[PDB]
């Protein structure tokens, strides 16, 4: 349930939120009140770019 809103009674617990392939742990702090759970389980990996390949520029084709 990524669309569940965090309520004051959930503070202090630990909940494992699905992100597409795995359940990731989220520890509820008081300043989290009012946010969706999915906001704390990113679904994409940060991008670290490599070298541009063949066809990446007009003169490389």
């Amino acid at each position: 349930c990524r669309d569940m809103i965090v309520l004051p009674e959930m503070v202090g617990l630990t909940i494992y939120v699905h992100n597409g392939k795995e359940f990731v742990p989220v520890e509820i702090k008081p300043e989290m009140i009012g946010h969706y759970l999915g906001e704390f389980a990113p679904t994409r990996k940060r991008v670290q770019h490599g070298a541009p390949g063949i066809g990446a520029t007009r003169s490389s084709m």
Binding site: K29, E31, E39, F40, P42, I54, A56, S59, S60
Partner: protein, 141 residues
């Protein structure tokens, strides 16, 4: 009578400008809000800023201290329903900057998606990033 420079709430204002536009040099005050405060003070928005008196400057600073208590509607302030106290507040300059910094820091402390976007310096309001938002230099093949 006329003064070329008038300091209001710790900001140097032009004296040859209309009062309503002169007030916008304060960070936190745009043209609409400045017209509202001029009207509440009982002052002509089109008078030159250099004809002000000391009592008028004091009154303007008092209005800017607490606009809501002086009759400015609660939907016109730049920080309604403050996160800490719950009141309807209006801030200028250093206090405004520190409140914005605190909001971003609070987002970052709980590791919310928006806070991570702030940290990495990437757009935070759902934009596509493949084509535009490029700031750098071309990579070679």
């Amino acid at each position: 009578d006329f003064r070329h420079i008038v300091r209001v709430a710790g900001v140097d204002l032009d004296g040859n400008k209309q009062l309503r536009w002169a007030l916008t040099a304060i960070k936190g005050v745009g043209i609409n809000f400045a017209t509202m405060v001029c009207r509440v003070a009982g002052l002509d928005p089109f008078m030159k800023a250099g004809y002000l008196t000391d009592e008028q400057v004091k009154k303007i600073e008092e209005i800017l201290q607490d606009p809501v208590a002086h009759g400015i509607p609660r939907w016109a302030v730049n920080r309604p329903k403050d996160y800490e106290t719950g009141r309807d507040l209006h801030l200028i300059t250093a206090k405004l900057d520190m409140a914005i910094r605190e909001d971003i820091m609070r987002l970052r402390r709980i590791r919310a998606y928006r806070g991570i976007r702030h940290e990495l310096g990437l757009p935070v309001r759902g934009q596509r990033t493949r084509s535009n938002f490029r700031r750098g230099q071309t990579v070679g093949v």
